[PDB]
């Protein structure tokens, strides 16, 4: 049985960065050759595994996370980068064996009005711990006032939309990201090639 690589790389919607949709591929022959078929991956950028060898290796599970970040930020979803996206929204660990893959999903996620359903977290008190997932609506203040959750001086809604719109340049265009990781534990490996 082959691993279900088709509902991960094709879906009609992808998780927005604040909710980053992790998933688990387990107990299946996985040939990472099913892909390399449709993604002119801007940045396949695999780290440490390289393409041919993983056809060969076997591991306990493969974790595939999916997000939608605009083009200028695709650099940040990598190891060792700092910025709004990798510090308040998704943090890759310092050490990694995985392949970020991004394709310009201009056609599906672009609304001429804007697609206000894709959003990112502008402000958080501390940088996210590696692979942390954080989902909340809580007001961020600058003053000491609790502010009672209203839109006012020193009171703001932390998520903000990407405002994706077609007449926008390459920098501001949806770029779906799939961060495949390789988890190996002392338990017997079940995801071979």
């Amino acid at each position: 049985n082959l691993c279900p690589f088709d509902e991960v790389f094709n879906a009609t919607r992808f998780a927005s960065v604040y909710a980053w949709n992790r998933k688990r591929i387990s107990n299946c022959v996985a040939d990472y050759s099913v892909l390399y078929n449709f993604a002119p991956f801007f940045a396949f950028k695999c780290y440490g595994v390289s393409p041919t060898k993983l056809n060969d290796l076997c591991f306990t599970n493969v974790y595939a996370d999916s997000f939608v970040i605009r083009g200028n930020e695709v650099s940040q979803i990598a190891p060792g980068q700092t910025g709004n996206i990798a510090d308040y929204n998704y943090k890759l660990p310092d050490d990694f064996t995985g392949c970020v893959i991004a394709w310009n999903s201009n056609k599906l996620d672009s609304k001429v009005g804007g697609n206000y359903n894709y959003r990112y977290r502008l402000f958080r008190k501390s940088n996210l711990k590696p692979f942390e997932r954080d989902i909340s609506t809580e007001i961020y203040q600058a003053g000491n006032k609790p502010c009672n959750g209203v839109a006012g001086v020193n009171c703001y809604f932390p998520l903000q939309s990407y405002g994706f719109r077609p007449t926008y340049g390459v920098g501001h265009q949806p770029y779906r990201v799939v961060v495949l990781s390789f988890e190996l534990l002392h338990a017997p490996a079940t995801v071979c090639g």
Epitope: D87, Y88, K125, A142, N154, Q160, G169
Partner: antibody, heavy 117, light 107 residues
């Protein structure tokens, strides 16, 4: 009132180390985006350094490794430790809080640095 | 970004309609702020995002733009409007300001 007395610095020999201090009225320094612009006399303002709400530091090309930024929770006082100075750093330095997208600002009156021999 | 402001000596009489044009080298979308620096006194923020004038400003200054070329407008030139205006882009890490357009009054 967001009024800033970012007043530190007056001048040193070339190769010295000065220490700026900023200050803060309605907000806390460690919770809001802040940065330090640099206005040379008679020239367009240039951007030196910037801090984030979680400690991320970004610098300018001309100040890579000579300048440092540092944020002080105890007394506001966004600190900028100028090190490895030179004879072309003479400029007026303004403390600045930038809320990123929703729009408000503080640019404090700013302090003069004339570092010479 | 190679920010470019085209008018540097522009002089209009009392109560006139003038316009400032800041131009960029890439798509900065709408993230370009307009500043106003009076002589000696610290700069003020006039139009954040290129399309939103901050509250409390008088209501004459309007700006609109997208992608590379941006424009700044002055609706009523009151005598107490002499300053130097700057355009800043705040989302590309090498934040580069513009040259300034020193405005003066004629009589």
């Amino acid at each position: 009132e967001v009024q800033l007395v970012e007043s530190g610095g007056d001048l040193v020999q070339p190769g010295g180390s000065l220490r700026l201090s900023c200050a803060a009225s309605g907000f806390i320094v460690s919770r809001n985006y802040m940065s330090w612009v640099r206005q040379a006399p008679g020239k367009g303002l240039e951007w030196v350094s910037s801090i984030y709400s979680g400690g991320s530091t970004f610098y300018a090309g001309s100040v890579k490794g000579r300048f440092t930024i540092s944020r002080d929770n105890s007394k506001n006082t966004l600190y900028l430790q100028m090190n490895s100075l030179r004879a072309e750093d003479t400029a007026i330095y303004y403390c600045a809080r930038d809320i990123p997208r929703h729009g408000g600002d503080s640019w404090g009156q700013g302090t003069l640095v004339t570092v010479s021999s | 970004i190679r920010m470019t402001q085209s008018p540097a000596s522009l002089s209009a009489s009392i109560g006139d309609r003038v316009t400032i044009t800041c131009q960029a080298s890439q798509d900065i979308n709408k993230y370009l702020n307009w500043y106003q620096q009076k002589p000696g006194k610290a700069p003020r923020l006039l139009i954040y995002d290129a399309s939103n004038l901050e509250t409390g400003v008088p209501s004459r200054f309007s700006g609109s733009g997208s992608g590379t070329d941006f424009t700044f407008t002055i609706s009523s030139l009151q005598p107490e409007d002499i300053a130097t205006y700057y355009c800043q882009q705040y989302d590309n890490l090498p934040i580069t300001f513009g040259q300034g357009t020193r405005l003066e009054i004629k009589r």
